[PDB]
Design a protein around this motif. Structure first.
Motif, mmCIF file in Angstrom:
data_model
loop_
_atom_site.group_PDB
_atom_site.id
_atom_site.type_symbol
_atom_site.label_atom_id
_atom_site.label_comp_id
_atom_site.label_asym_id
_atom_site.label_seq_id
_atom_site.Cartn_x
_atom_site.Cartn_y
_atom_site.Cartn_z
ATOM 1 N N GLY A 1 14.508 22.433 -28.427
ATOM 2 C CA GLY A 1 15.057 23.282 -27.391
ATOM 3 C C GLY A 1 16.188 22.660 -26.613
ATOM 4 N N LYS A 2 16.428 23.247 -25.449
ATOM 5 C CA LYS A 2 17.509 22.831 -24.578
ATOM 6 C C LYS A 2 17.314 21.413 -24.030
ATOM 7 C CE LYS A 2 20.824 24.478 -21.165
ATOM 8 N NZ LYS A 2 20.562 23.435 -20.117
ATOM 9 N N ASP A 3 16.063 20.969 -23.933
ATOM 10 C CA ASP A 3 15.761 19.647 -23.407
ATOM 11 C C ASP A 3 16.347 18.578 -24.322
ATOM 12 O OD1 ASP A 3 14.333 20.764 -21.194
ATOM 13 O OD2 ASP A 3 12.368 20.144 -21.977
ATOM 14 N N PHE A 4 16.397 18.891 -25.613
ATOM 15 C CA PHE A 4 17.038 17.993 -26.562
ATOM 16 C C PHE A 4 18.566 18.119 -26.557
ATOM 17 C CE2 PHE A 4 18.806 16.719 -30.663
ATOM 18 C CZ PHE A 4 18.421 15.377 -30.626
ATOM 19 N N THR A 5 19.096 19.332 -26.707
ATOM 20 C CA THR A 5 20.550 19.501 -26.792
ATOM 21 C C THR A 5 21.253 19.045 -25.501
ATOM 22 O OG1 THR A 5 20.402 21.925 -26.390
ATOM 23 C CG2 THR A 5 20.541 21.177 -28.686
ATOM 24 N N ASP A 6 20.542 19.102 -24.366
ATOM 25 C CA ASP A 6 21.037 18.570 -23.095
ATOM 26 C C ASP A 6 21.322 17.056 -23.076
ATOM 27 O OD1 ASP A 6 21.071 21.042 -21.765
ATOM 28 O OD2 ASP A 6 19.265 20.618 -20.589
ATOM 29 N N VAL A 7 20.714 16.272 -23.963
ATOM 30 C CA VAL A 7 20.959 14.815 -24.000
ATOM 31 C C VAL A 7 22.179 14.427 -24.824
ATOM 32 C CG1 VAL A 7 18.454 14.353 -23.719
ATOM 33 C CG2 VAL A 7 19.488 14.108 -26.019
ATOM 34 N N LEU A 8 22.700 15.360 -25.618
ATOM 35 C CA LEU A 8 23.831 15.071 -26.544
ATOM 36 C C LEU A 8 25.117 14.725 -25.765
ATOM 37 C CD1 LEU A 8 23.070 17.879 -29.262
ATOM 38 C CD2 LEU A 8 22.490 15.397 -29.391
ATOM 39 N N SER A 9 25.933 13.851 -26.334
ATOM 40 C CA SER A 9 27.150 13.391 -25.705
ATOM 41 C C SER A 9 28.370 13.714 -26.554
ATOM 42 C CB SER A 9 27.096 11.880 -25.452
ATOM 43 O OG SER A 9 28.337 11.486 -24.896
ATOM 44 N N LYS A 10 29.356 14.368 -25.953
ATOM 45 C CA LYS A 10 30.605 14.644 -26.639
ATOM 46 C C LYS A 10 31.483 13.380 -26.859
ATOM 47 C CE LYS A 10 30.632 19.489 -25.246
ATOM 48 N NZ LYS A 10 31.462 20.644 -24.667
ATOM 49 N N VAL B 1 22.481 24.325 -32.975
ATOM 50 C CA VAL B 1 21.764 23.052 -33.151
ATOM 51 C C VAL B 1 20.263 23.236 -32.993
ATOM 52 C CG1 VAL B 1 21.451 20.661 -32.324
ATOM 53 C CG2 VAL B 1 23.826 21.691 -32.491
ATOM 54 N N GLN B 2 19.880 24.033 -31.989
ATOM 55 C CA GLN B 2 18.461 24.336 -31.771
ATOM 56 C C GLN B 2 17.819 25.042 -33.000
ATOM 57 O OE1 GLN B 2 18.297 26.352 -28.049
ATOM 58 N NE2 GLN B 2 19.391 24.690 -26.972
ATOM 59 N N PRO C 1 13.164 6.717 -39.399
ATOM 60 C CA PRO C 1 11.948 6.492 -38.554
ATOM 61 C C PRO C 1 12.052 7.214 -37.206
ATOM 62 C CG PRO C 1 12.686 4.451 -39.545
ATOM 63 C CD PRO C 1 13.811 5.437 -39.747
ATOM 64 N N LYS C 2 10.944 7.818 -36.758
ATOM 65 C CA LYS C 2 10.952 8.559 -35.509
ATOM 66 C C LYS C 2 11.387 7.670 -34.346
ATOM 67 C CE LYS C 2 9.884 12.935 -36.434
ATOM 68 N NZ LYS C 2 8.678 13.579 -35.896
ATOM 69 N N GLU C 3 11.012 6.380 -34.334
ATOM 70 C CA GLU C 3 11.342 5.468 -33.216
ATOM 71 C C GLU C 3 12.857 5.218 -33.137
ATOM 72 O OE1 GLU C 3 8.837 2.191 -34.212
ATOM 73 O OE2 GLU C 3 9.944 1.759 -36.081
ATOM 74 N N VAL C 4 13.506 5.223 -34.300
ATOM 75 C CA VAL C 4 14.965 5.096 -34.375
ATOM 76 C C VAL C 4 15.698 6.372 -33.877
ATOM 77 C CG1 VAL C 4 16.956 4.839 -35.918
ATOM 78 C CG2 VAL C 4 14.860 3.307 -36.256
ATOM 79 N N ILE C 5 15.256 7.555 -34.316
ATOM 80 C CA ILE C 5 15.818 8.815 -33.825
ATOM 81 C C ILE C 5 15.692 8.869 -32.297
ATOM 82 C CG2 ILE C 5 15.823 11.378 -33.780
ATOM 83 C CD1 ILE C 5 14.353 11.203 -36.582
ATOM 84 N N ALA C 6 14.485 8.575 -31.797
ATOM 85 C CA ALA C 6 14.209 8.538 -30.343
ATOM 86 C C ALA C 6 15.179 7.586 -29.598
ATOM 87 C CB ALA C 6 12.745 8.143 -30.091
ATOM 88 N N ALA C 7 15.298 6.350 -30.101
ATOM 89 C CA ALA C 7 16.195 5.323 -29.578
ATOM 90 C C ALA C 7 17.654 5.803 -29.636
ATOM 91 C CB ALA C 7 15.986 3.994 -30.388
ATOM 92 N N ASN C 8 18.006 6.509 -30.717
ATOM 93 C CA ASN C 8 19.383 6.945 -30.919
ATOM 94 C C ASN C 8 19.853 7.917 -29.837
ATOM 95 O OD1 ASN C 8 21.755 6.862 -32.910
ATOM 96 N ND2 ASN C 8 21.505 9.054 -32.640
ATOM 97 N N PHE C 9 18.932 8.777 -29.402
ATOM 98 C CA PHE C 9 19.215 9.849 -28.450
ATOM 99 C C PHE C 9 18.707 9.587 -27.013
ATOM 100 C CE2 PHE C 9 19.554 12.099 -32.548
ATOM 101 C CZ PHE C 9 20.821 12.616 -32.384
ATOM 102 N N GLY C 10 17.894 8.553 -26.825
ATOM 103 C CA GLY C 10 17.353 8.250 -25.501
ATOM 104 C C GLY C 10 16.240 9.211 -25.106
ATOM 105 N N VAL C 11 15.429 9.611 -26.074
ATOM 106 C CA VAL C 11 14.338 10.562 -25.843
ATOM 107 C C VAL C 11 13.058 9.884 -26.326
ATOM 108 C CG1 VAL C 11 15.860 12.647 -26.027
ATOM 109 C CG2 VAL C 11 14.582 11.810 -28.135
ATOM 110 N N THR C 12 11.910 10.502 -26.073
ATOM 111 C CA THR C 12 10.654 9.946 -26.537
ATOM 112 C C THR C 12 10.358 10.513 -27.910
ATOM 113 O OG1 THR C 12 9.244 11.722 -25.680
ATOM 114 C CG2 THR C 12 9.822 9.973 -24.102
#
Ligand SMILES: [Mn+2]
Ligand SMILES: [Mn+2]
Ligand SMILES: [Mn+2]
Ligand SMILES: [Mn+2]
Ligand SMILES: [Mn+2]
Ligand SMILES: [Mn+2]
Ligand SMILES: [Mn+2]
Ligand SMILES: [Mn+2]
Ligand SMILES: [Mn+2]
Ligand SMILES: [Mn+2]
Lengths: 377, 377, 377, 377, 377
Positions: free
Chosen positions: D359-368, D352-353, C171-182
């Motif tokens: 884009g970078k706005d997404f890959t920037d949130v990733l945590s090692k 990953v992109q 689910p998109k809401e889970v992916i969003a929650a997983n990464f802290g994005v909208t």
């Protein structure tokens, strides 16, 4: 004397501690024919090598796939009842076929239309109970000892459903509701199964016959095998019961074979299914021909179970001075055999000669008539 | 005399033809303990009930899953070689463990690094050949008779790869190419396998030792079991060989047990795996406790194979006037047992008392030391 | 010309419509050696007889247990990537081993401790990815074509877990929650898997190396096989990679074998496990010796998969005028073989002579050193 | 209110009689995410849908492969003991792992070297009993309720071997002989198993410790899980016990996970084996990603068992207003996970992109760094 | 209130977090009858615990062997269609039987001789589609909700072959060639399956009947079950449809049972095969008697699937204040039962008395007529 595993210049004396009584019973296993070759599964098991379940009123012991793993489709019980003793009202998944070796018994069965059948069975008689139909056995004044065959090798003498066990594991309020009685009226129900139990001899069969609104069963569940005319050949007799004559016996076809001293059940195979054997009396050997130059010889005597996998070539030779008597059992709706002699007799002689590297002197002895049991010259 | 399946008011006399010699051998099966209940698989099979393969130089007979289906993981051969006779160079998928019951033999093995091991094995010695490593056996001046155990119950004495059989089924031009010889130089190769064959006695072991460029094998493939110090208890002795002492024996753990007349291998179980048994000499009974109120008693004597499925409770009682000698075999890297006595000895006495409804007079007899074989008072 | 299944006075011409091109490829199957006998399972399958999955950026075809049922433990894919093309980030249950036949590729893997490994693999190099660890492949400027082996024969090229397929079925809401994005920020996620896709060539390897807080992987996931010193014998070369040298390769042991024209991989067996084969180039025959006088000869050429069940005797003969190059693959932690020549060389000569009915002229040619590939005189 | 299986323009109201209470418990099953597709096996079963075996002193109920067939390797019992009540001295084939949810208990175990271990276990503590080693449980003053996990899905709460059942099915003369006592001295032995029985509270632990000649056990059989430092992330905590820290726990690896309201166990998989789950408290949903566009969402609450087959992608979201607390159990010697976030964080950003079409706005949130439990923004 | 697993002096209160709603639904599982004993497989599963596949036009959810593993031979789908909605033209390996619980639908089927059958089915009507014959369902103005039963427990709602899916995965040039049309003429074919789709209500049935050159189907594929005369007994009604009356229904035999409040489906078993159950409405308990003192009680309500393995003893008691309505389904060509009451009624009274330890007051209540549903006094 002391037999040794020596055949001409092959084999050697046994140097370790050994079972000389078993070796004497198995002369064709300790010293097989030179023509045996290859790996063949075990095709022999004795009831004497089984645990005997003893009860007040008799005993029961079993040979199943857990004892004789080649026999996946058929299993057996040797059961003994004292005079009057009852094998408790019960049912099971497997169809059951029986041969009365000793004594006599009264059987009951009620079918899925509520029709009842009650009959007395004596020595040489059969019964057959279709899968799931409930029944009982009660020995008459001589007691009874009989061989039971079940049409699954995985049969387990306690996957069997007993009347009193069912009631013991049903809530009392449900039993009461089921019959329209009070809990108090059924308080004396047994707390555990009876299985086999002592009882007074019954009255005459005619006095037990139960009438009902649902009519007579269409086909009887007992058969007088030894009252039939057997196939008689020079060395013995064969009595066959299958679904063509014993009409209810849909999943079990049977033959009782008697082989005189100096005789043999001829070279044959069964084109339909596996043979399961019970040795009632006497002493035999049989070679099982398994294809691709595989053959193995087994010895049998009273109390032994044998087996011949589907279409394997075999014979059964009397190796004793008394009659050999055994049963041939099949999970099928019919008995069928192919005789080696009759097969070759029904082909062009020169064609048979081309195969066997033998002449007219041989093909001249062949018989177009099937003789299941032949006598040594 | 004539034993009968009667225990007090239970059972009855046998009315049909029967095997009285087998009944005499199986007193605890014809008349089991009253404490036996339920269905347990067969745990007993005699080598005397097997086909004996006779060859020029000896014989071999086998007990496999086709005879004893409970034993899916372990199979056995009883092999006998005359003086000088050779069990042909061969290999197989299964690892092989052996116990020398009679005589002596020279074994060879060459490993996957081309390192050779040649040694003489006498009575009470073992060998173990890892899976796939090629080997041979040659009996010395007394001949040899030994028990082989293979770590698959499905073992088939002819899935076995023989040197001469391999060459007989390889094109001659390939064999020639393989060795750098002409077809003519290998024309005398055998056309079929030898398997077991007669031969002159070998020379001294020291004269056969083959040196090579690849070094000594890291671990020996033979073990002198009866030269070890046994666990000695009041009623007998136990000698253990597993991968902890017989270092190469990775898949087979073993114990030779001797039980004096009036003694018994104590109540125990194995927490690791199934037990496979061979009865070298004497007469025993064993009850196998299968859980959920299932237990079944078996009789054994010289030539018998037994079995105890993983963690089932058991004991082995000497029921004769000679020593009972048997092997306990396990498909594992170690031998382990849990003693009933020692288990209870190591718990708080009042806790044991709460379980058994017995007092201090009982818990006072418990021993914190394990005595594998105990003697009757 | 038109080959016929005739060998001396055996066989006959083919009278029905037939596949003459296949017959020409299989001369030792249409006309086997006279020494072949018995039933042996099929041990040969061509990648050319498989469906090719074509994608934008390459292709993939597979030989599994659904094609070659003898091979229950090992399966293979032939995969091809165009320059820059990406085999999508993914994982699976099976461990994966690879041999780079053509070109080059960059691989990534991240382990369960978050440690990353990125490396370039060229011709004659290997990789191995432990079960469950996620990875990718990207072809460099030449493209890439490679053989993949998976340690389950039941491998299915789509039980494989793809990054984009996982996200598409979350689910998109889970992916969003997983990464802290909208949800809006991830709206451009692909709706279905990519699997293989075209992409620009990557930059230099040094620029892609990802640093992290979790350290370096303890063992590399690539191996330069053809940079190792091979076992060199008269007729060819053998390069071995197993867990002893390619430390991460715990479930796959491998050998690349090159056999000169007029040479053969000698008579041997493997004492550890089944052999799976891939024929990179050239033309071969192999006879598989299955015990009990069973043997069957197979032909192989480039694109073929072969198999040798555990411990079966075999050789691989170059039957062409170019080098024969093939892989020997095993689901084990080590490579092991037993050489027929070396085995016999390490035994007493008179003992070998007693087996083979040959003299000193033969035993004198035996070599205590193992030569995996021998050359015809 | 009355939920309906409607999602936008898909589904319809339920027109037949239905289970509205179950529908309310399963909102993501009655109305799954639009991203669920394909057939996935059932991964959910409630202890409340099992038969409860009630005894004097407590109860026990089980979830096995006969209830949840996806779980072939792991089975569970929920057991409850009243104060002082004893789970009878016993052993079984399976290793046993336990988590103490409520109360406290004293356990005993004696190993195969006769070494004893007795200890008290409280809330958040574990035990692990190796296969075949005999043990007991006795609840202390609060009583005890705990979750047991066994490393075979086929576990049957009565293949279990009870001390008193063994003795009840052993001949009295053998028991007497085994201990050196008379039959009269053991006449008060129970006639049937106790299983669970009431008893007085024990004394202090220090007073029960049994000394012996065989030494201390090398490794303890209990573990204080909640006394360890957990992995703490924004939304919750993870406490891991496997063979690396709880040294005896060789076949069971475990994690207790706590997920705050508004948090989730992140998108991950296990690269080693199947996950078995027990929901101690709270309310969850999980989507299981099965490859090839197969995914199915399940709801769980207190009392439920879940499962995630080997390497399938998943997350566990708290869908309630209380903490979600559950166990992750694995039949392995170690705990391992691959985090989706950490995996992508450790790869080149443009790679990953190229996969995600982001884009970078997404890959920037990733945590090692791995954060097993994340909190919603 | 808060139920507890306590029965007299057995059991205890639940101390851990729990599912009180499920416990309330399962009173005879949380607190079983004292007569339940032993391990019995799970025989209960709710449709409410399954994933609901929602489509434009309805939904479908399934209970298969992946949910209820005891049921290997029979599987079920609960399907719902909105008015006019179409379950797409399709076929499958399994035969399909159906019961219309709500509404009405038009079905089509064309047989292997090109004969068509189109009919309307309303509440209490059945259909049966032989294996492999293609069919469709279209809901009429009320919509439709129905129970489907398939004669393999392994049924997978997408091994199902859809018309549009077949065409979507066939080359366009082949479809064109098949019909004699151009590729352009079939360019508007759907790219993926429809499965369930919205559509306008059809016209009158008489207007849809398709005539053809191949004649009328010999037997209809629908049956008006509730229009038949039921077996009426004091507590309810039984309507049977098997191959004897619903002639095409060769592999499925069925009974719809209605049990009044205070009534019960009497103690009985089936001598032919396993029973699969669906609970349409009301609340029940059933005890399944499994032999050898094994019995386990289950609760059921609307939406539940039950099961009774072959020949196991059982009853079904209404435990609610509304009628209990359920289906009994069998993979057989006939319905058969054995009534406990009728069985005993048809035996000699003193023989029944000898078994039950009860007198004439009991045997006097027995009925020779079968009453499938009895009412409490
Ligand atoms: Mn019977
Ligand atoms: Mn015959
Ligand atoms: Mn050997
Ligand atoms: Mn033992
Ligand atoms: Mn991969
Ligand atoms: Mn090889
Ligand atoms: Mn336990
Ligand atoms: Mn997880
Ligand atoms: Mn359908
Ligand atoms: Mn029924």
């Amino acid at each position: 004397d002391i037999p040794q595993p020596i055949r001409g210049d092959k084999g050697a004396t046994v140097k370790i501690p050994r079972n000389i009584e078993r070796d004497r019973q198995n002369p064709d296993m300790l010293v097989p024919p030179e023509t045996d070759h290859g790996t063949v599964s075990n095709m022999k098991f004795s009831f004497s090598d089984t645990h005997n379940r003893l009860e007040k009123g008799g005993y029961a012991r079993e040979v199943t796939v857990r004892e004789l793993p080649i026999s996946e489709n058929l299993a057996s019980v040797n059961m003994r009842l004292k005079p009057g003793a009852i094998r408790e009202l019960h049912w099971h998944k497997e169809a059951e076929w029986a041969y009365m070796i000793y004594g006599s018994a009264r059987v009951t069965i009620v079918d899925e239309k509520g029709r009842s059948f009650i009959d007395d069975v004596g020595e040489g008689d059969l019964w057959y109970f279709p899968s799931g139909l409930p029944h009982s056995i009660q020995a008459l004044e001589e007691g009874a000892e009989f061989l039971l065959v079940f049409d699954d090798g995985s049969f387990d003498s306690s996957n069997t459903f007993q009347l009193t066990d069912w009631l013991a594991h049903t809530p009392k309020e449900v039993i009461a509701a089921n019959f329209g009685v009070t809990k108090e009226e059924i308080s004396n129900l047994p707390g555990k199964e009876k299985y086999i139990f002592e009882n007074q001899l019954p009255g005459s069969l005619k006095d037990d016959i139960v009438e009902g609104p649902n009519g007579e069963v269409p086909y009887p569940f007992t058969y007088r095998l030894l009252e039939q005319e057997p196939i008689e050949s020079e060395g013995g007799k064969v009595y066959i019961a299958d679904s063509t004559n014993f009409k209810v016996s849909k999943t079990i076809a049977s033959a009782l074979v008697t082989v005189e001293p100096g005789a043999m059940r001829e070279l044959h195979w069964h084109p339909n299914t596996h043979e399961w054997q019970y040795y009632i009396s006497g002493k035999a050997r049989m070679t099982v021909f398994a294809s691709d130059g595989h053959a193995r010889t087994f010895n049998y005597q009273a109390g032994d179970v044998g087996y011949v996998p589907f279409a394997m070539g075999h014979y059964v030779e009397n190796i004793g001075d008394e009659p050999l008597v055994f049963l041939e059992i099949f999970k099928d709706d019919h008995y069928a055999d192919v005789s080696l002699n009759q097969w070759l007799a029904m082909l062009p002689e020169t064609f048979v000669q081309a195969h066997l590297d033998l002449g007219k002197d041989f093909t001249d002895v062949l018989s177009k008539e099937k003789h299941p049991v032949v006598k040594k010259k």
